[PDB]
Assembly symmetry: C6
Homo-oligomer: 187 residues x 6
């Protein structure tokens, strides 16, 4: 049911198959996070990896400082429901086969035999990103997705092989058409 | 058991059948919330959707503010499920997230695919909150927004296709006759 | 094992069979609460209703103000033990087939296919009582039991049909005879 | 295993058999509490009653007041059940409420039908609390009040039939001989 | 796998078989606590007792006052692992067949059909010790183990029969030889 | 899957096989902690030991003090088990205490028999803490102390037999090639 529906979505998924680390950069709705998650589940289901780690930084665009350094994690739990049977999800969560966690919980780990997705990566620092990327173990895949910040790594890893940058655009944004019609109505 | 009883009710359920987003506006007891939920449960059972999300804003008419902004208000939504689902199945549906009952704030950042979503007590919302709600619409989903800044949406979306406004009236309020007799005694 | 043992107890139960709402008014020990509960269980066991809701107001006669607006609810849980197998009780409580709760938790509900008992109703206001009585759905029964307050509704609903007032008296108070002998000893 | 050993003990258990309320008064170690409990368990097992309620007041001789008035004091009642019930069955009996171990305050407002009820450490009660306890008596129940304002009840109920006072003495205190020898060593 | 390995260890265990109360006094490593625990488990496994109670006083040598009158109890839980299958342990703990608790939780009990071990008894007062020893029921064994304090009871119960004092010494201390070699290295 | 890859790694695992205590000292990524754990799991599985205890001190290089002295630091030890144990078995091993992951403070007063014990991040320890750790050694156990007051132990125990020091170097650091390339990009 969950397939790429634009050229740029096909290219993106094709990059994930052929590269160990992929950056999916694009606007909300372009499949950058969603399609990565679907490949993660595909990978787990076909035993290419033994676990899936979904992560996000504790900072959110245009939100006020909330804590002293879970709502932000809810969309990650929610999108799993389209890809895994909802009753199996708590089983996976308990065994830690699927892990949904803040970026801070990655520190000092080596992530082997895993599909790791760092989402909303625009909200990261270069130092936090270095920490994430260097968690990479053997037999794993990383997808870093987001919508200076990670313009530094885009530049810094421009020549590195087995890394890929996919730029999705407004043209890759496939929504139910009522969303557009409603948004226009508000404008 | 659960059925449209008035012409207005029949027309409403017919609108839910034929539209992706329906606004059920009427007085307490007109079936605006109840019949939406019965259709949600019907959709789930016949696999038209794989989950039900029931939601209300954290604000109620003529009640004093109760917290630092951002369960008592949600209790009646839980309660009405008991009419439609076998009460022992309910906690396992809640546990698996197949039925979700949650505050509107918990909708932020989501895309609701393959879901029957009901926002209740929508008169207690603002334009901005409504716009956030409606734009959560994913694919294969249904939304029913029910209430008794809503007037503003009535206007904004009045030209939009696959959206429908169903006005229910006092004439659609079907209660046990004793309720009216007791209400009169107190008059 | 739990039968009416005076004329007035028989009449009371006979009112519950033939009326949608019944007020059982009498002193402690007359069966006003106990016998209602037994009919509720009878109703549930024979599938005339699908759930039982037992409720009480947060105010108790001659007790000091305890909270900021569970001990009071304990006798309701306790009397269920005479009527349901104690090991089944937690099962019923979890599925919400049996609900023991304060009166406040009734607000905004419609109680369908239910046997509802508001106990210690002397401790209610006319406004709280109006709220309770207007919760009545279809296929339900209500028994309001207690020992101005509800003298107002006694007056106000004196002419209403399918409502009944049963006055039990000291003559309906059937205790183990040792209770009387001990109470006399204290006097 | 558990048996009356002295004449006084035999007479006591005989009183429990033939009376609805028994007062077992004696020193620690005389079997006043233990043998009541053994009879309670026997009653439950042979279906003479469907539950056991064990209760103590929240007050103890020569102990400083421990809380704002109205588990350590209750631990020995739990402990003695281990002698009479298979230890793994105990939590399921507690969970089903078939065995209840609770403070006297939790008795208020109840009618205890089909129950074997033991109020222990009753010397620590007042007339008013005792009167509240005894008047919880329902039908098909047994009460044993045991202790080492009780003197006042001895007087008040001394004429009452189906109540019995059993005085146990030092002569009924059957302990392991080593306990006495050690108590002497310390003298 | 867990046997006495010195003459003094054999004598100790032989005292436990032939006496109702035994004091095992010796340095860390001599088997005084460990071997008592092993006999307790032996006793439980062969149904000579129906439960095992391990206890320790809330005071520890050369530690600062920690609380207002669990780390201290951890070695007791830990040593059970050598004697019981680790997965069975939580089962035993839940049914209270094995009890690991502070000395305070013994107060007011009678310990029947039990193997009781008070460990680190050097940290006890004569009054606390009197309380412990007088908990003794029928069909039970007590071992008090430790490394004035209990010199008073050593003196006080010197003539009492069915009590025994086993003095283990440095000669009874059997460790892995690397422990000695490492300790010497530090010296 | 998990194997020594460099000469240094082979030699290390060989030392663990032939010695009761091994010190694995090297840089992050040299397999000093990981390969110890893999041998621990292997020991458990082949019944050479009946439990695994993984431990770290509550102190980390260049991190600010985080509490009043005496889970984030422990997370990577939990994580690495996922590589060696079936993730669903992990919580049941934790629940049964067959795998223990704990702070060094939790070692005090124990004798670790029939166990594979790994103290990690041992560079963060003092002489006194190390001495406490090593002297927990029981019979049929293995200890691996791994790190990147340790220098002092290297000296103190350098003559001791059945203890071994394995120095791993940068040459033993086997990572995914992309990690190095990314580390360079950032340089």
């Amino acid at each position: 049911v969950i397939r790429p529906k634009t050229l740029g979505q096909k290219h993106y998924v094709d990059a994930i198959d052929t590269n160990t680390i992929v950056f999916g950069l694009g606007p909300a709705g372009s499949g950058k996070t969603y399609l990565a998650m679907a490949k993660a589940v595909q990978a787990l289901q076909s035993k290419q990896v033994s676990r899936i780690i979904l992560t996000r930084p504790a900072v959110e665009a245009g939100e006020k400082l909330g804590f002293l350094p879970d709502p932000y994690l809810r969309p990650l739990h929610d999108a799993l429901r389209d890809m895994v049977e909802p009753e199996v999800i708590p089983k996976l969560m308990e065994a830690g086969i699927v892990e949904v966690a803040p970026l801070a919980y990655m520190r000092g780990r080596t992530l082997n035999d895993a599909f790791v997705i760092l989402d909303e990566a625009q909200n990261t620092t270069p130092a936090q990103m270095k920490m994430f990327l260097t968690r990479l173990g053997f037999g794993s895949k990383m997808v870093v997705t987001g919508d200076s910040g990670l313009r530094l790594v885009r530049h810094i890893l421009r020549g590195v092989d087995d890394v890929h940058f996919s730029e999705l655009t407004s043209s890759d944004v496939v929504r139910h058409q009522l969303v557009g019609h409603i948004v226009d109505a508000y404008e």
